C-alpha cells in the first residue's frame, strides 16, 4: 500500500501492464517444455508492446524494457531445468529508491507479489544489497519486476557494477568490499580501487 502509493502504482495498473502469453503453456513449467523459437517470437511482441505504451513514461518511477537479445541469452543459459516464471520475470522492470526496506517488505502480504530480499546478504553474498519484487497476474502472464534500493546501497551497487565490468565478476571480492564500505573505507570509486589494491597485496 504505502510503497505503491509513493511510486504511483497499484494492483489495477500492474494488471493492465501484464502481458498475456499465447504459448498455451503454464509458466510454472521448466524451459525444456518450451520451444525456443516460439518463446523468442513472443518476447519480440512483448518488447514491441512495451515500446508503444506512453503510460509507462507518465508513471512516477523509472523503468527499462529488456531486449530480445537478453531473453535469447537467458534461455540458452537456464535451459532446460529453470522455471519459465523465474527466467522471464523482468521484461518490464521498474527501479526505485525506497526510504527504508521496511516499506518494501509490506509488499509480501500481496497475494500476487513475491519478494526476494537481498538487503542483508543472508544468501550468496556478492556485495550487492536490495530487494526485488515480482508481480504476476497468473501462471500465463509475464511477471513484472520492481527493484528497490536505499541511496546507501545503490551507491555501492553502482561502484561494484563498474569494478565487476573492469576486473570481472568475483563473489568473495564483492562481499569483502561491502564490509569495507559499511566501515567507512569506500567513499568514491578511487577509494574502492585503493582498498582493492591493499586487499590484493595482503594475500
Amino acid at each position: 500500500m504505502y510503497i505503491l502509493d509513493k511510486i504511483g502504482l497499484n494492483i489495477e495498473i500492474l494488471e493492465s501492464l501484464s502481458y498475456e502469453s499465447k504459448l498455451g503453456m503454464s509458466f510454472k513449467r521448466t524451459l525444456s517444455h518450451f520451444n525456443k523459437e516460439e518463446v523468442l517470437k513472443e518476447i519480440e511482441l512483448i518488447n514491441n508492446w512495451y515500446f508503444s505504451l506512453e503510460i509507462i513514461d507518465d508513471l512516477p518511477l523509472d523503468s527499462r524494457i529488456k531486449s530480445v537479445s537478453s531473453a535469447k541469452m537467458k534461455f540458452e543459459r537456464y535451459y532446460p531445468n529453470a522455471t519459465y516464471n523465474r527466467v522471464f520475470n523482468d521484461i518490464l522492470g521498474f527501479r526505485v529508491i525506497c526510504k527504508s526496506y521496511d516499506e518494501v517488505l509490506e509488499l509480501e502480504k500481496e497475494d500476487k507479489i513475491r519478494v526476494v530480499d537481498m538487503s542483508r546478504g543472508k544468501s550468496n553474498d556478492d556485495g550487492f544489497r536490495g530487494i526485488h519484487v515480482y508481480y504476476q497476474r497468473d501462471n500465463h502472464h509475464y511477471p513484472i519486476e520492481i527493484q528497490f534500493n536505499t541511496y546507501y546501497d545503490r551507491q555501492l551497487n553502482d561502484w561494484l557494477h563498474d569494478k565487476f565490468y573492469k576486473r570481472g565478476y568475483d563473489s568473495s571480492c564483492g562481499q569483502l568490499l561491502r564490509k569495507y564500505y559499511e566501515n567507512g573505507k569506500i567513499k568514491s570509486a578511487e577509494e574502492l580501487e585503493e582498498v582493492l589494491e591493499d586487499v590484493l597485496y595482503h594475500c
Binding site: 514491441n48 515500446f51 508503444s52 513514461d57 523509472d62 527499462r64 537479445s69 553502482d158 565490468y165
Partner: protein, 74 residues
C-alpha cells in the same frame, strides 16, 4: 513524455541513446533494428539515463537515422 531508446553491445561498455516518443512508430523501428543488428546488440527502452548507470557513457544522437548508423558501429 518521452523515453530513451538505447543500443549497446553486451560485453562492451557505453551506448547509443536517442530521446523518442513511445508508440507504434518507435516500437516497430526498434523491432526492425534489433533484427538488422543481431542478438549481440541489445535494443532497450529506458525512462531516463541518470537512472541507468550500467549504460554509461551515453552517446546521444538527434535522429532515428543517426541512431541506426551509430548502433551498427557498436
Amino acid at each position: 513524455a518521452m523515453c530513451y531508446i538505447i543500443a549497446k553491445r553486451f560485453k562492451k561498455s557505453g551506448c547509443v541513446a536517442l530521446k523518442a516518443k513511445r508508440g507504434k512508430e518507435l516500437a516497430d523501428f526498434a523491432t526492425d533494428l534489433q533484427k538488422k543488428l543481431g542478438y549481440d546488440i541489445q535494443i532497450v527502452a529506458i525512462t531516463r539515463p541518470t537512472a541507468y548507470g550500467e549504460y554509461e557513457p551515453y552517446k546521444f544522437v538527434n535522429s532515428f537515422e543517426e541512431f541506426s548508423i551509430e548502433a551498427s558501429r557498436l
